[PDB]
Symmetry: C5
Subunit: 252 residues, 5 copies
Amino acid sequence: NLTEKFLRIFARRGKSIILAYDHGIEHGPADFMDNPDSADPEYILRLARDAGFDGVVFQRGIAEKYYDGSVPLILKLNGKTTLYNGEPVSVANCSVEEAVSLGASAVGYTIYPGSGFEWKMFEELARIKRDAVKFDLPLVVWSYPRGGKVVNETAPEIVAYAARIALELGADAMKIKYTGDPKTFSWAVKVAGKVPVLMSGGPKTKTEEDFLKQVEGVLEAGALGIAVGRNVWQRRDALKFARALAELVYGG
Amino acid sequence: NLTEKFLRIFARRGKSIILAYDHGIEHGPADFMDNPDSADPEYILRLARDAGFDGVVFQRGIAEKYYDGSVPLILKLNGKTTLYNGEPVSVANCSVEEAVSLGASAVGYTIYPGSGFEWKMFEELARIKRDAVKFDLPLVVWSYPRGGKVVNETAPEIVAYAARIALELGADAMKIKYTGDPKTFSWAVKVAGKVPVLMSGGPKTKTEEDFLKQVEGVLEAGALGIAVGRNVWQRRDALKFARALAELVY
Amino acid sequence: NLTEKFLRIFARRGKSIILAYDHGIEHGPADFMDNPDSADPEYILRLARDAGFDGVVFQRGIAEKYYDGSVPLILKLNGKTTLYNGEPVSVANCSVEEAVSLGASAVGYTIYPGSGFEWKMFEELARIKRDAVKFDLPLVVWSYPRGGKVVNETAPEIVAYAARIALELGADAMKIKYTGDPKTFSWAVKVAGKVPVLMSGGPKTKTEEDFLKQVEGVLEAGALGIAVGRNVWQRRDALKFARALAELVY
Amino acid sequence: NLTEKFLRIFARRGKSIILAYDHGIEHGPADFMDNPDSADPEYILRLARDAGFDGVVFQRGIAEKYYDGSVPLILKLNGKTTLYNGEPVSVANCSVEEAVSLGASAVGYTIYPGSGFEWKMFEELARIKRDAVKFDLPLVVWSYPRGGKVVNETAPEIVAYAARIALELGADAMKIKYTGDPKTFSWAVKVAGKVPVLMSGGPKTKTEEDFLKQVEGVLEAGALGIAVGRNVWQRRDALKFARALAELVY
Amino acid sequence: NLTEKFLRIFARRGKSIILAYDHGIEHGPADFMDNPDSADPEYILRLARDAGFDGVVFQRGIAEKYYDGSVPLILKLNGKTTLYNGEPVSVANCSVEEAVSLGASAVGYTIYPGSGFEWKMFEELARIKRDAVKFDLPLVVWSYPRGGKVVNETAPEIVAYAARIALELGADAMKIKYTGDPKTFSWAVKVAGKVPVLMSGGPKTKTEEDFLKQVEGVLEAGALGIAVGRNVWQRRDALKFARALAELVY
């Protein structure tokens, strides 16, 4: 049972905080400027360890050059850029077998339900899923409806659709966007059934209290925890705020 | 003879009812709200068992997390969403070999004849058919003409085309849309020849009686039975209505 | 020499009549209504045997469910529908190895020279040809220029091009459309060289004598014979007319 | 060194004349009418033999049915038609391994640099080149920039780009269009380096003297020789003229 | 550690100069006219060794026909032409296994982040990276954002994105465009982390001092060095200027 394996490694305290760090390919380095140490993967590993978080998310190149075994790794297999203008598509740049060789405890893959290329990602995810089972690595699916008929990615019905597709296609855990309130988010959590749900972090909020309030709602809705990037490492008080998130999530 | 195998497993009584549950990927969970337990695959397996139905249809993810061997399983290999806007296409997210491993007694695959991508699904179906034969699992084809010159999906000439194509491509059983009357639907059943036909369920009808009359016509036309989803599990009286169907079909 | 094998099996008397029955996927069942028994493949095999024809053409599904070894079989590997609107393309839904398993004495494949997808069909034919040689099954190519710059499919120069392409790509026998006169059709036959040419039957003619006169012209032009579908099985005097064709051709 | 092998087989006298005969697929049979024997591949082999030429170029189908080992063979692996209207593309209809079995001493492949599909042919050529090395058969590249920014294909800078691309991708010999003058053609020859260059024949010229003048310029420019089709076999005095070309070139 | 192997072979003195020579396919031979010996790969090898440079970059054809082991070789696996008008895409014409056979010490591959085909190059780069690791050959990525939202290829934010992408995808070393000042270029170097950066050379500058000042900025920003093509071999004083570059960099 790969969901059970995921919970043992990444949620030993009953809830989970993952520090996401695929931003270098997805958005590029501009956002690293507010807190420049954030461009150094070594800083990121130290932050996760010092805040007592459960894991980090790296692309293959960062894992090969920097990963040191100090915190559990989710190897994010696909990536795309914001420079791209076509229908949303993100293809694998790494195999599951290679992810095992790089020290990963799980693999990650993004889908964009609704995209004109939704079929390309479903076809490839099928091969990745089959390999994840073969190598006994849990599959974490980032489910982000985008393209086609999608006009509001945080609409209650779109987030609940995101959650259900990830379950149907074989995710062992998933990452989805927050709706902005615990009632509607609790429906997304419910339709995901046995597969745990992590809140996607998002752009840096206006105040720390805005983000902590969103986290409180996610937990109230029955989610497993958060996968946070910018709202930790883009802050100059990254470590102090990370430790406040830990107390909210693990203590609450 | 995989048609004979299909009939032994899914139609021991001479007719068949399958509980379809691929909705979560195909349409998303919005329809689960009317009867909120319908979002729970465990609740769906109990309903099939308790109503005395022949089978359930799950995608790979639901089968892996929830299937427990209690009712025969058709593993639906491909899936698409209603968020998608392009030419109709649905690709396999699971192999026949993996279906066998998940406890399947048959495999399912949707084609959309007429689509700009009709070739992509015929190409994949060729591989799935070869594997279904190799692993001795019957192939059930959902045949839904869509795109291209198709305007009315329930027109008699379109449903008959859907049925003939499924036979020509190697289906051991098929699922097609009802025409709305037994005479035209009997032509589709005829052109399917030795391959049995199941009626696709469709959106929840205005009354329970509206659906019962549809099923009556389907049986009069010589079809094997029904593959029903929403017209059972979207109802708050799901089990009661499911037992009325069983009495009708069997 | 796979042409020699083809002639031994399908042209023992020196000329050939093949009964074509891929119409269920290519056009759908609409035309079967004229002579309803034509929707039953069992009836098709009976017609072929009782007229003394040389072979039949089936898709994999039909061959799997109905072929009984009583008349030599050409297994048609690709198929498309008329519901499709894109640039013309037809992909294989069956392999040569599977055709051998179903009892085929030859395999068939359609190309559409000029299509925006002409590359896709040439790439797949290459794989099929290689397999046909490996399994020692003659390859019969239906050569139907369509799409791109093709405006009149029965123009003398288009039919000659169709014939030559089939030869160049490795056809062991071919099937092309009639130009409507023996002089221009004799040029298509000449440019096909050592590869024998079968006339494509086409839509049902206004009278039986119109079709017989086409056949007379085809034989005058030096063609091996005819692959006929509708002009036999769409008629209620199917057997009687089939015997008249056998009289003329043999 | 596959260039040295190519020269030993196809240029024993120091220069080369290759009789090209892929016209049947590339342009169709219309041009065979002037000298009707040109439609017959046997006549082509006799002509190359009687004239003392170095080789012939056949597609796989012609080689399989007609090639008799009497003159060295280049097997042209890819082919497209003039009926096709999309971005220029020509895919392989035969493998290198199959070419070896059919008696080829070399393989041929066309690229269209600048095409929207240039990537598709470069991707396939990589596979063909790897196999050419594996089977020890020289690779002859027909380099014909077409599509994209290309307008006039005989412009000096386009023909030089054509020659350089063929060298860079791994050609052991190449075939390119003439610029119409020896000075610009010699720059194409220079940037091709160690890889020898054959002039592409082109449409039949107004007079025999026009063609002979072109050949004189190609030789002055330092090319290896010519790959001639129409300008030999489209003539009623084909053998007489072919013998005059032999006297000039050798 | 393949970065360490790259540094040992191509940067033994602590900084690196590579002589790039994929121009023949990427741009064509027009530029070779200014200094005509530049069309001859033997001249390019002699130039790199006489100037004391660390390496040369060749496509497969040039390496097969001309490489002699005299200077370390980076085999550039993909290539496209300027004749092409679509969304930027460049596909492999050679495998890592073949590059090993041709004497390569590293392999090169270009990506165009932002292109409508960015996925096609990421998917291929995945297989190349896997093979680079298997055969123990460093992977050098040319990262040139182009297409999509990219409108200024030398903007600070774009060159930093180029560098970061190459790190994320598995490059052991990278080549990117200069921003025009050392402060913004040092941010690109920083975000590349442990992966060394080479400056892409570009079109011939108006003066030698314009290029020398760029190279001075590059070194000030902390880059490993330069991969120069035109700004050396397009000059009539190629060797003199190459020796001045070496004095500055080493």
